[PDB]
Design a protein around this ligand. Structure first.
Ligand SMILES: Nc1ncnc2c1ncn2[C@@H]1O[C@H](COP(=O)(O)O)[C@@H](O)[C@H]1O
Ligand SMILES: N[C@@H](Cc1ccccc1)C(=O)O
Ligand SMILES: N[C@@H](Cc1ccccc1)C(=O)O
Lengths: 242, 795, 159, 109, 55
């Protein structure tokens, strides 16, 4: 019986195939862990936004090339579709006085569809404000983040840039064989205008804020040729990120 | 130990709750964990004298009797606890009082004899365990007041745990002094008057090894009445501190103990030979102790000896000889100090843990002996007969414990607590604790009191300032630190994640004792030498596990007995496998283990009630291991592992190397007490599969792919994994998908052979594949399949 | 790096993790997708005939001009995407918010977070032991029960 | 500092139970710490149960392992998981965490 | 386990990393270096399982 009742133990067992997450979700997760341990609380905002929170509170305001520059989808004079998860930066700060500390993953919307652009996509705002926080910390924390993110394979740069709601602003651009240089996140110190109109004294507190494109982080890391593949959802494609 | 509130309030009495006290001592760092009234509750019980104890009898063992209180008219009661003597001043419940076990004093004759009204005994009053019966007071009681008031009965024994440090809290005094220090108050100490000798110059007492007994006090006290009756108040402080009042002499040494922290002991001069020698015991010198048995004494063990035999272990215990007996006339009072590191080991070595050992092992005040000698002398001659004798004080300047000067920086203090305690309030707290302090600009100089054995370094000194100021009122602030991330690795795989997946495939997590039935795990692993636990909680829990397989099969049977088998458990934790190449002698590897058995699913309307087999486990771990790790690399080679069925059992591989085992347990082992129905079991060497592939996006191909089924005939002695794994290698660029979709045997396939229908799917990134190009690349496989093995037709 | 206090954040045990539900969903063999939030009304209207939606003036395209009322329009577009390709049997889920025009909501819409999924094709795909049966409602029902708060409640669930 | 310890701990207790007192920020002794303390919860079934010990690190220990007590301080704690648990969800006999009854376990799904 | 994860969760947020130890340990580490050492209530009091004179 112990001989006569042998079975072929290499036959495949019974189970349903496993189901991974989508790559941007995978990226979001990693990042939230990275920042989880620095004590950044996770915060959301609607994806339908107004003329105050996307733009005018962030010190756009209206007659700024930005509104048009973010190829904005409006619904009328007033309702628009988030352009950035920089809304929550305003929304959070108005609900609590500092010693804040938060990320803020969401899906923003634009008006471009291209190898590295989509009419939707996802962002991670970070905000931190307290009597203490500086440029070196912005640089310190982002370097430190990129290190863990890529694990240090990739060639980055950290330049000056411009955002009406920071100053100094900065971008980091990462190169990944193509291409070449990809805008990955953008950041700075919280513009004092933006601290004032939100109820925090600039003379007492300073802050740094940032927003990184998830699909761009995701492309580079797993080298996805084409950002637009992220939402066609070919199972073949998704399944390689199990 | 245990103490009696009202004896402490004697030494220091805060104006605060009984409850407030307990809370206040527990924040002093010695946790009160008991509070008991000393008696049950009652009213209308009073002292009174029997002035006349008439006969009787006419009921035999009963005495009829006229008793008297204060509010006159003499009270007539009946009694028959037979030590009911003539003139006794006694405790009596009057016509209407109520005793514990709430019963109602009435008035009824007893045997036609006078009516009412019970005379009392300790037991019937809530203070447990009987003497003869009928309480016998010390004459001159208030011939009419409440026994509650007279016998100080509104009192709690209050039981505490005292941490090995701060050994100064094991008499009443120390505790009193610590409570005093809290409430700023002063400590009211009883007047202890030296006795002044009145007899012989006496007794040759040599210390052979002083470093272990610096100070030894002895005092011979001639011709004392041994069977004197320890007077109630001493019977009642002693009993309210958890000491059965034993004796007379023995009680006073116990009383001084509880009162001052000091462990006294008394002897029989008329059994002590040519003086006492306080010495280390010769190696193996036996000494029969106060409880029948001898002891083989190792040469580091101080003994209180005589000029040619050993009497009693050093500050531990006595001698079924050298103690107080029935015709003891004269005694010598020991009241000594011992170096605690010359007491530490010994008592437990022999399995003794007496009051004395305990105080002596963590340190009795070496400035206490004299004072304790004088209280124990005055208290013996008051209670027993006899007279005094010279205190034979043989001390040792040098080995007498040496108090040390601590210096304590305003900074260090502020830098370790993180809260400023005003200069002016730290000096006090320190002095009031007992120290001699000189303030000195940014720092203090403290001299440690003699009685405190835990003040040696600066930090010990800040425990104290914090301790007293009040933890309650040291503020909470959160720690200020850098935010650095620390190094992540996307490639490593959390066990948390696996535990979840496992338990989404229907699996209860379990935690098992790491030590188990040695007898039992031999049936599992046949005489595979297990790391041996000499002296454990049990014979059946004495082996460090080499699998969890033991812990787990133990855990199925457990619930199996609770009527319900259908168990799916896994566990993580380490195996302990003996290796002389390990760090220490054991390989300590993290492991993953589980077992399944019984019905695939429970009772369900539309799921087959088949029981669970090998591939149900194989799929479950094919889930884990893999498509979570990497897969496609692992493999299930068949292998014998003593305690699982050879035909249905496999070693799990993963590029080359064993990472584990999975099988249905072997039959006779299932029958081996172990319970009902076939059971499946697996173990994985975790660290080997705690790491997965980080992906890289690979092109897609918008060309359609093509499916091509093949019927592969092959001997029953060929794995089917291998055939497949062999096609995606002859694979290249590209057959993209191999899949086993059938296994057929019997009619129209050579007997002992077997067909595997296989479907390879072919796709290309460059072109949409040519009708001919297809047949070609299947042929490359089909041909390599009869490279190895054979081939390939029908089913 | 930044000098800060290490204060805790205010966790609550009684709250359930989306991230946990997705694992349960993956463990059941559902694959996560993310679809565009603006779908085609000509089709949404097919799935949600009449109940209609927050259209979008000057969109990227007319197919992508209506804000989703639900996750289904994007969900079924994904199963056709793949079924056209020519991989039948798809079983996916997605979390995201929908957008129903509500007058008593902030601005005119009620963005609610939903969880949505399709399964179709066979149960256990192409295997040497397993039954090649096509998926049915009790499969989904069961998947949903395990998602359902057998990860919280469960037991006040009614279908 | 200590305030750090007392603080860190409050926070963690304020989170581990969701405000079910009683607690005790109470003094203790561990030869590896000084000062040291203990928490002790009650949550009925009767008497207080120790659930952690803690202290500022004893300067011996630090030096013992190559850290200068004159320049660094630290704190350490030792939590008892099952009595934490026992308290938290209201288990009585703690001994019943390793008997592993399926019925006991199941309610902890 | 729920309670451990839960704790790790709370503590991970403040930075704390997760270390481990071997469970079969020696004199040096369980006591000695932890300032005990050999003759200190602790040892027997801790209600200790010994394998031999240091393991
Ligand atoms: N599809 C997209 N994905 C990610 N970021 C985008 C996308 N479309 C526009 N952006 C934003 O473009 C800004 C600057 O990048 P660029 O398009 O290189 O000039 C950043 O705020 C990006 O988040
Ligand atoms: N793309 C983000 C970049 C950014 C976010 C937050 C701060 C600074 C920069 C934005 O334009 O809003
Ligand atoms: N083992 C110690 C744990 C502890 C660690 C650190 C400081 C204090 C205590 C205990 O029994 O409590």
């Amino acid at each position: 019986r112990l001989a006569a009742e042998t079975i072929d133990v290499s036959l495949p067992g019974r189970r349903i195939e496993n189901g991974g997450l989508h790559p941007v979700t995978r990226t979001i997760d990693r990042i939230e862990s990275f920042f989880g341990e620095l004590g950044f609380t996770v915060a959301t905002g609607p994806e339908i936004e107004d003329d105050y929170h996307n733009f005018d509170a962030l010190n756009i305001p209206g007659h700024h090339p930005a509104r048009a520059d973010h190829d904005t989808f409006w619904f009328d004079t007033t309702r628009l579709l988030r352009t950035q998860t920089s809304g929550v930066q305003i929304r959070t700060m108005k609900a609590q006085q500092p010693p804040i500390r938060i990320i803020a993953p969401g899906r923003v919307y634009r008006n471009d569809y291209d190898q590295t652009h989509t009419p939707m996509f996802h962002q991670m705002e970070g905000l931190i404000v307290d009597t203490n926080i500086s440029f070196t910390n912005l640089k310190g924390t982002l370097h430190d983040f990129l290190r863990n993110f890529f694990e240090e394979d990739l060639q980055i740069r950290f330049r000056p840039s411009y955002f009406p709601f920071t100053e100094p602003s900065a971008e980091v651009d990462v190169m990944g064989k193509n291409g070449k240089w990809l805008e990955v996140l953008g950041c700075g110190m919280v513009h004092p205008n933006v601290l004032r109109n939100v109820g925090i004294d600039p003379e007492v507190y300073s802050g740094f804020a940032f927003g990184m494109g998830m699909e761009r982080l995701t492309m580079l890391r797993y080298g996805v040729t084409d950002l637009r593949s992220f939402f066609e959802n070919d199972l073949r494609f998704l399944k390689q990120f199990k | 130990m245990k103490f009696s509130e009202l004896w402490l309030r004697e030494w220091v009495n805060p104006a605060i709750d009984s409850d407030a006290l307990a809370n206040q001592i527990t924040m002093a760092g010695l946790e009160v964990d008991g509070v008991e009234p000393v008696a049950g509750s009652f009213h209308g019980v009073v002292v009174g004298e029997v002035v006349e104890c008439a006969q009787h009898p006419n009921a035999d063992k009963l005495r009829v009797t006229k008793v008297n209180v204060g509010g006159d008219r003499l009270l007539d009661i009946v009694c028959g606890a037979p030590n009911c003597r003539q003139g006794l001043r006694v405790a009596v419940a009057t016509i209407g009082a109520v005793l514990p076990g709430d019963f109602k004093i009435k008035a009824a004759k007893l045997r036609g004899e006078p009516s009412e009204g019970m005379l009392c005994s300790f037991s019937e009053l809530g203070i447990s365990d009987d003497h003869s019966g009928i309480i016998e007071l010390p004459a001159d009681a208030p011939i009419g007041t409440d026994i509650r008031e007279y016998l100080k009965l509104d009192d709690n024994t209050i039981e505490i745990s005292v941490t090995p440090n701060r050994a100064d809290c094991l008499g009443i005094i120390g505790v009193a002094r610590d409570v005093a220090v809290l409430n700023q108050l002063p400590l009211v100490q009883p007047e202890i008057v030296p006795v002044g000798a009145t007899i012989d110059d006496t007794l040759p007492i040599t210390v052979e090894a002083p470093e272990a007994c610096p100070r030894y006090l002895g005092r011979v006290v001639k011709g004392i009445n041994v069977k004197a009756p320890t007077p109630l108040w001493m019977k009642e402080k002693l009993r309210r501190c958890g000491i059965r009042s034993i004796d007379a002499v023995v009680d006073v040494t116990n009383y001084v103990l509880l009162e001052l922290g000091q462990p006294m002991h008394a002897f029989d001069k008329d059994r002590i030979e040519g003086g006492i020698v306080v010495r280390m015991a010769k190696e193996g010198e036996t000494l029969v102790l106060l409880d029948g048995t001898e002891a083989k004494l190792n040469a580091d063990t101080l003994v209180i000896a005589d000029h040619n035999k050993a009497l009693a272990m050093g500050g531990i215990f006595g001698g079924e000889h050298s103690g107080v007996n029935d015709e003891t006339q004269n005694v010598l009072l020991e009241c000594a100090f011992f170096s605690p590191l010359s007491i530490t080991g010994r008592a437990r070595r022999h399995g003794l843990h007496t009051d004395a050992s305990h105080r002596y092992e963590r340190g009795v005040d070496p400035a206490l002996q004299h004072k304790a000698m004088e209280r124990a002398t005055r208290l013996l001659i008051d209670i027993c007969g006899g007279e005094a004798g010279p205190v034979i004080d043989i001390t040792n300047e040098a080995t007498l414990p040496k108090r040390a000067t601590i210096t304590l920086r305003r900074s260090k203090l502020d830098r370790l607590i993180g809260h400023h305690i005003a200069d002016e309030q730290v000096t006090d707290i320190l002095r009031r604790l007992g120290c001699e302090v000189t303030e000195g600009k940014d720092e203090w100089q403290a001299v440690a009191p003699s009685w405190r054995f835990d003040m040696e370094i600066e930090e010990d000194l800040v425990e104290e300032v914090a301790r007293v100021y009040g933890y309650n009122n040291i503020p909470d602030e959160p720690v200020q630190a850098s935010l650095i991330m620390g190094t992540h690795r996307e490639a490593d795989l959390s066990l948390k994640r696996v535990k979840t997946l496992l338990n989404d495939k229907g699996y209860q997590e379990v935690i098992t004792y790491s030590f188990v039935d040695p007898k039992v795990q031999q049936m599992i692993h046949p005489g595979v030498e297990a790391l041996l636990l000499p002296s454990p909680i049990s014979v059946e829990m004495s082996a460090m596990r080499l699998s969890l397989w033991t812990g787990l099969l133990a855990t199925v049977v457990y619930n199996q007995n609770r009527q319900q088998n259908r168990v799916r458990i896994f566990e993580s934790g380490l195996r302990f496998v003996p290796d002389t190449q390990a760090p220490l002698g054991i390989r300590q590897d993290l492991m993953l283990a589980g077992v399944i058995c019984g019905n695939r699913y429970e009772e369900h309307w539309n799921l087959a009630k088949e029981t669970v087999d090998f591939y149900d486990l194989k799929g479950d771990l094919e889930s884990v291991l893999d498509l979570t790790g990497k897969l496609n690399e692992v493999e299930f080679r068949a292998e014998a592992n003593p305690a699982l069925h050879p035909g249905q059992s496999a070693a799990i591989y993963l590029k080359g190397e064993r990472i584990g085992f999975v099988g249905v347990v072997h039959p006779e082992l299932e029958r081996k007490l172990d319970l009902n129905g076939r059971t499946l079991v697996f173990e994985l060497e975790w660290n080997k599969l705690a790491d997965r592939v980080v992906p890289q996006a690979r092109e897609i191909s918008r060309f359609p792919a093509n499916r091509r089924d093949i019927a592969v005939v092959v001997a029953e002695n060929v794995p089917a994994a291998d055939i497949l794994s062999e096609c995606k290698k002859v694979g290249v660029n590209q057959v993209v998908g191999v899949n086993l979709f059938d296994v057929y045997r019997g009619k129209g396939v050579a007997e002992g052979y077997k067909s595997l229908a296989i479907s390879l799917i072919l796709q290309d990134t460059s072109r949409t594949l040519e009708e001919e190009e297809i047949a070609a690349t299947v042929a490359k496989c089909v041909e390599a399949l009869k490279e190895r093995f054979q081939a390939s037709l029908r089913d």
